[PDB]
């Protein structure tokens, strides 16, 4: 049924949520470090 | 009928989960900026 | 009504509706036959309700799982074992107890007869009586014989 495929897509998106949070955390650490570096360099 | 409605509901749930993925990425992006001011204050001018 | 899990068909539920078309895959027939099954599918709860208890035939109650039916069968075997014990081994024990009770009653009757003789004869233990089970005319003959010493 289409319900099973839509539920599989929902599960995939739910996993992608956890993946994307962790992926964006590392990049955001760079932004935080850049703000700290600007504050220091001033 | 019921199967199609359940499929539509699960598709809406998938869309909500993808929106939550984007929201969590942006949330990490903001949270790294969040609470950095206190660390800079205790690290830079306190020093 | 009861113990219908033993005749279960093992999206479907134990109904056995004794005296359906939808988007759900109704093209199916459960094996819950002793009763009969109806076209239903778990994709739509409405179809299952219609095929089980919405109208007409009513869904029969069953043990929650077929494992409950298996446990009921095992408990039935154990209950048959216990009943057979009570009816054979405990019956032999009861027969032995009945024999012991007959022996004890005979001993008590002998003691009572000894007491009656001591009342009607010398105190030291001495008896010459007899015990049997004759007919009523036999009892009359015994009374005629023993009218010499009657109570």
From Swiss-Prot, chain B:
Which branch of life, at top level? Eukaryota
Q: How does it assemble?
A: V-ATPase is a heteromultimeric enzyme composed of a peripheral catalytic V1 complex (components A to H) attached to an integral membrane V0 proton pore complex (components: a, c, c', c'' and d).
* Family listed: Belongs to the V-ATPase E subunit family.
Q: What does this protein do?
A: Subunit of the peripheral V1 complex of vacuolar ATPase essential for assembly or catalytic function. V-ATPase is responsible for acidifying a variety of intracellular compartments in eukaryotic cells.
Protein name in UniProt: V-type proton ATPase subunit E
> What species is this protein from?
Citrus unshiu (Satsuma mandarin)
């Amino acid at each position: 049924l289409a319900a099973e495929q839509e539920a599989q897509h929902i599960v995939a998106a739910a996993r992608n949520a956890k993946m994307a949070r962790l992926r964006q955390a590392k990049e955001e650490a760079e932004r935080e470090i850049a703000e700290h570096r600007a504050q220091v360099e001033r | 009928q019921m199967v199609r409605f359940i499929r539509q509901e699960a598709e809406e749930k998938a869309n909500e989960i993808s929106v939550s993925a984007e929201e969590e990425f942006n949330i990490e992006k903001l949270q790294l900026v969040e609470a950095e001011k206190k660390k800079i204050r205790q690290e830079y001018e306190r020093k | 009504a009861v113990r219908d899990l033993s005749n279960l068909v093992k999206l479907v539920t134990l109904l056995a509706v004794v005296p359906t078309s939808y988007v759900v895959p109704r093209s199916s027939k459960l094996l819950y036959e002793d009763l009969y099954t109806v076209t239903l599918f778990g994709r739509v709860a409405d179809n299952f309700r219609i095929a089980a208890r919405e109208k007409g035939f009513q869904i029969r109650d069953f043990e929650y799982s077929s494992e409950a039916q298996e446990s009921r069968n095992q408990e039935l075997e154990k209950l048959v074992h216990d009943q057979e014990s009570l009816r054979s081994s405990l019956l032999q024990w009861c027969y032995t107890s009945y024999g012991e009770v007959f022996s004890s009653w005979m001993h008590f009757c002998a003691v009572r007869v000894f007491a009656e003789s001591i009342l009607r004869y010398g105190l030291p233990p001495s008896f010459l009586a007899c015990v049997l089970a004759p007919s009523v005319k036999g009892e009359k003959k015994v009374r005629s014989i023993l009218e010499e010493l009657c109570g």
